[PDB]
Design an enzyme around this catalytic site. Structure first.
Site, PDB file in Angstrom:
ATOM      1  N   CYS A  85      11.175  28.937  46.842  1.00  0.00           N
ATOM      2  CA  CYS A  85      10.775  29.902  45.831  1.00  0.00           C
ATOM      3  C   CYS A  85      11.140  31.356  46.166  1.00  0.00           C
ATOM      4  CB  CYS A  85       9.309  29.705  45.454  1.00  0.00           C
ATOM      5  SG  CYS A  85       9.017  28.104  44.601  1.00  0.00           S
ATOM      6  N   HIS A 144       4.482  37.896  43.767  1.00  0.00           N
ATOM      7  CA  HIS A 144       4.901  36.512  43.649  1.00  0.00           C
ATOM      8  C   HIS A 144       3.900  35.808  42.715  1.00  0.00           C
ATOM      9  CE1 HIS A 144       7.092  32.946  44.524  1.00  0.00           C
ATOM     10  NE2 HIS A 144       6.151  32.384  45.260  1.00  0.00           N
ATOM     11  N   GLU A 173      -1.546  36.944  49.165  1.00  0.00           N
ATOM     12  CA  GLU A 173      -0.693  38.048  48.750  1.00  0.00           C
ATOM     13  C   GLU A 173      -1.520  39.329  48.594  1.00  0.00           C
ATOM     14  OE1 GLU A 173       1.739  37.307  45.378  1.00  0.00           O
ATOM     15  OE2 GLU A 173       3.144  38.914  45.912  1.00  0.00           O
ATOM     16  N   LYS A 223       4.421  35.788  36.208  1.00  0.00           N
ATOM     17  CA  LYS A 223       4.323  34.328  36.128  1.00  0.00           C
ATOM     18  C   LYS A 223       3.157  33.901  35.220  1.00  0.00           C
ATOM     19  CE  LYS A 223       6.530  33.002  40.514  1.00  0.00           C
ATOM     20  NZ  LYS A 223       6.822  34.379  40.966  1.00  0.00           N
ATOM     21  N   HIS A 238       6.368  29.594  36.681  1.00  0.00           N
ATOM     22  CA  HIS A 238       7.018  29.756  37.967  1.00  0.00           C
ATOM     23  C   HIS A 238       8.416  29.131  37.904  1.00  0.00           C
ATOM     24  CE1 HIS A 238       7.904  30.105  42.058  1.00  0.00           C
ATOM     25  NE2 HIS A 238       6.821  29.599  42.620  1.00  0.00           N
ATOM     26  N   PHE A 293       8.164  27.610  50.334  1.00  0.00           N
ATOM     27  CA  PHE A 293       7.987  26.566  51.349  1.00  0.00           C
ATOM     28  C   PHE A 293       8.884  26.857  52.543  1.00  0.00           C
ATOM     29  CE2 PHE A 293       6.684  22.796  48.392  1.00  0.00           C
ATOM     30  CZ  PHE A 293       5.491  23.441  48.138  1.00  0.00           C
TER      31      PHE A 293
HETATM   32  C1  LIG Z   1      12.081  20.610  43.157  1.00  0.00           C
HETATM   33  C2  LIG Z   1      12.238  21.943  43.818  1.00  0.00           C
HETATM   34  C3  LIG Z   1      12.742  23.032  43.284  1.00  0.00           C
HETATM   35  C4  LIG Z   1      12.820  24.302  44.079  1.00  0.00           C
HETATM   36  C5  LIG Z   1      11.829  24.192  45.192  1.00  0.00           C
HETATM   37  C6  LIG Z   1      11.048  25.119  45.672  1.00  0.00           C
HETATM   38  C7  LIG Z   1      10.087  24.913  46.773  1.00  0.00           C
HETATM   39  C8  LIG Z   1       8.654  24.955  46.258  1.00  0.00           C
HETATM   40  C9  LIG Z   1       8.117  26.360  46.344  1.00  0.00           C
HETATM   41  O1  LIG Z   1       8.532  27.146  47.178  1.00  0.00           O
HETATM   42  C10 LIG Z   1       6.958  26.558  45.365  1.00  0.00           C
HETATM   43  O2  LIG Z   1       5.724  26.178  46.045  1.00  0.00           O
HETATM   44  C11 LIG Z   1       5.775  27.438  45.385  1.00  0.00           C
HETATM   45  C12 LIG Z   1       5.685  28.711  46.215  1.00  0.00           C
HETATM   46  N1  LIG Z   1       5.494  28.574  47.521  1.00  0.00           N
HETATM   47  O3  LIG Z   1       5.815  29.797  45.647  1.00  0.00           O
HETATM   48  K   LIG Z   2       7.950  38.982  42.229  1.00  0.00           K
END
Ligand SMILES: C/C=C/C/C=C/CCC(=O)[C@H]1O[C@H]1C(N)=O
Ligand SMILES: [K+]
Ligand SMILES: C/C=C/C/C=C/CCC(=O)[C@H]1O[C@H]1C(N)=O
Ligand SMILES: [K+]
Ligand SMILES: [K+]
Ligand SMILES: [K+]
Lengths: 413, 414
Positions: A164, A303, A314, A335, A340, A399
């Site tokens: 993300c 975020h 955050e 968001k 998201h 992640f």
């Molecule tokens: C199927 C995956 C598509 C893109 C993957 C992104 C990883 C998941 C994230 O980072 C989201 O968990 C949300 C976050 N940490 O903001």
């Molecule tokens: K942002």
């Protein structure tokens, strides 16, 4: 050598709020929600019932049907948004400047829908009926690949994949390319088409998604009753350009990119570090990069995913970095409206950050009905604020402990 | 407003490849012309036209971590974590709370956890979404190699994952190089990892005719040979530790060599086919040479991309002539994919390691299996036998789908 200044000269977007930048931005500053019932897959099979989908998007309005058929949706969105951005920039990419125009667009997962459908063909028709186009259609760097082909951009060429944080890292990396003189123009941002069976299955399995069935309240960043993110799709692409190059062609300038921070929590595969310490460090790195004091930040595009941990941590990170100023600046999560967009989140949120400066308007966080004692900053609830902005900071986390921050500035000669 | 320019050296190497489960084994096999290619065992290949692959030999992940930990990592992540730990141990780097924010990780993968995706999706289709693992998403995503390495090492600095197809390993290292050069980290653990030996990967690369259908492992991978007919797919990870020079000196680090040039271009031509005469590849080599601030004539050895497809080896040869002119016949070129197969996203990682060792050890690894000369590929490919030689500069190429071209230049350190 001196660091080059890097300005924003074009914007392009597809989002749940509109199939162009103006519509997306205009909806954002009017608190419009892009969240509705899931239609892309069968919602019966998942606890999540809502999503932020593109509406009325017909790819054939932008390219031949046979060209679109060789692109996964994530690539379609990227090519359409990039072309929009270059047209907005009024940039003529000739043979002469082609080697100095590059592309750095990321995606969190790339062509997952294509992988799923092709694997199903593998299982039912056999491996010998898998498409010759399967591999290029699936790989996340094909957004950059197809954009460069569509534009004739022959310069620095890459794709960052950082979950993300993707859209924000991609723009920061492109920023650094131009700063060090290795390109005059970079078409950059993030794209994602994650509304698929396995994506819903996977984010349901780890309880990441809101299971609130009411599209009116599902995405509510900073609200006491938040319970997970609402998944969206789209692409946010901008044209970054070296300043003298921009001036010499009479380019319009939305703003300047001045700071970029990247850190890792080194803590846990999915859970953010305690107190958001890693995110605090990324914001501090971006601030040092921009050469400013924290008090100069006017607005933070958070975020703000509407998960329990993210919005709490955050908030803590913002207090750590800004101290007393944390209660003086404005924060908001768009968001609340767009959902998201995962790897594309940083891209659309960079666009919103840039337009906030250009037009002097802070977009709101909608849907906060029950204040949370742990999330007690000014989240610009419900209604946009007309205000002259000098500096805006945008955060993305992902992640794998990725923390990424960009700082934008009002353009002054 | 000053642009910082630090010197960046290589202080640690770590690898898993079809030539061995560490750097010493992989390297000694490479300079002895040993092939890592054999029959496919990872999947049942009866339904594919391709019959050979380059697999890790006797790699048991439980020798490096508990089974319970391994079961939460796709093979691509297993390889990255094992290789990265080996690289950091080789560097004798102790990462503490104090230098943690100055130590980063930038490891790419071309596709990430494809085996995990295949198995989890088959579960979805046969058992339903409730049976999909909570760990599916983090296990699959390409940046989890960087994420898990970061967690294992305690590395809290600049953190990323480049995904650029077969250019991935080379782009990742170049990007990490630029991070240190501009002053934003003192150490970067960087490279590429891939575990692409899966049902869909074989199906996909057979469907687009990229793989060699040669059933003979003795001749399947033969870069620059007249009868080359596609690449042989491999797996593994190549990870190196890049470090800012003064930092390396202060902690008494050993230095293998210096990274001095990085070039990145796009063909902007076709999704899978390379541009005419490798023009994009030529431009990337030229950008790396400019970045290094040297004359083309200073390059002693090129570790080619050399995949053993008709068009790659032909166009790469043309690109080399375009860039180096008459010097093209004076320098040495070789493709170690003749021995390792094509590690895809990890190719640039392992090939960076071989390039660095070629300089440190003064040995150029050969291209094996060239039996029939091709009039179009008429350079010096160091056939059959390693060549001992003092090297000052080495250039390594990678090219990928999406028209990505990436080149690194390494230099002997005084
Ligand atoms: C199927 C995956 C598509 C893109 C993957 C992104 C990883 C998941 C994230 O980072 C989201 O968990 C949300 C976050 N940490 O903001
Ligand atoms: K942002
Ligand atoms: C299905 C697995 C995908 C991981 C890697 C993809 C890279 C595709 C490529 O670039 C390869 O075609 C080889 C090349 N151009 O060297
Ligand atoms: K939830
Ligand atoms: K073939
Ligand atoms: K190479």
């Amino acid at each position: 050598m001196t660091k080059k200044r890097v300005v924003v000269t074009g914007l392009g977007a597809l989002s749940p709020l509109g199939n162009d930048v103006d519509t997306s931005w205009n909806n954002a500053i009017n608190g419009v929600s892009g969240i509705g019932p899931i239609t892309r897959v069968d919602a019966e099979e998942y606890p999540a019932k809502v999503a932020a989908e593109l509406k009325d998007f017909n790819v054939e309005d932008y390219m031949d049907k046979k060209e679109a058929r060789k692109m996964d949706r994530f690539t379609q969105y990227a090519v359409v948004a990039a072309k929009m951005a270059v047209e907005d920039a009024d940039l003529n990419i000739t043979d002469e400047i082609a080697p100095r125009v590059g592309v750095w667009v990321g995606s969190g997962i790339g062509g997952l829908e294509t992988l799923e459908s092709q694997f199903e063909i593998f299982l039912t028709k056999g491996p010998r009926r898998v498409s010759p186009f399967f591999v290029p259609m699936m790989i996340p760097d094909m957004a950059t690949g197809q954009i460069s082909i569509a534009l004739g951009a022959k310069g620095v060429n890459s794709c960052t994949v950082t979950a993300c944080a993707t859209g924000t890292n991609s723009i920061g990396d492109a920023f650094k390319v131009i700063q060090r003189g290795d390109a005059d123009v970079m078409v950059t941002g993030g794209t994602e088409a994650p509304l698929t069976r396995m994506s819903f299955a996977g984010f349901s399995a780890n309880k990441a998604l809101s299971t609130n069935p009411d599209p009116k309240t599902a995405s509510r960043p900073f609200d006491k009753n938040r319970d997970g993110f609402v998944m969206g799709e789209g692409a946010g692409i901008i044209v970054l350009e070296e300043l003298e190059h921009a001036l010499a062609r009479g380019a319009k300038i939305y703003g300047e990119i001045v700071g970029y921070g990247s850190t890792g929590d080194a803590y846990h595969i999915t859970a953010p570090a305690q107190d958001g310490e890693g995110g605090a460090r990324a914001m501090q790195e971006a601030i040092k990069d921009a050469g400013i004091a924290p008090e100069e930040i006017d607005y933070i595009n958070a975020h703000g995913t509407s998960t329990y941990y993210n919005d709490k941590y955050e908030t803590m990170a913002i207090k750590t970095v800004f101290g007393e100023h944390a209660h003086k600046l404005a924060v908001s999560s768009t968001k609340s409206m767009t959902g998201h967009l995962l790897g594309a989140a940083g891209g659309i949120e960079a666009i919103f950050s840039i337009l906030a400066i250009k037009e002097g308007v802070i977009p709101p966080t909608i849907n906060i009905q029950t204040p949370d004692e742990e999330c007690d900053l000014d989240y610009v609830p419900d209604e946009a604020r007309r205000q002259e902005l000098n500096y805006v900071l945008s955060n993305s986390l992902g992640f794998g402990g990725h923390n990424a921050t960009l700082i934008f500035k009002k353009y002054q000669s």
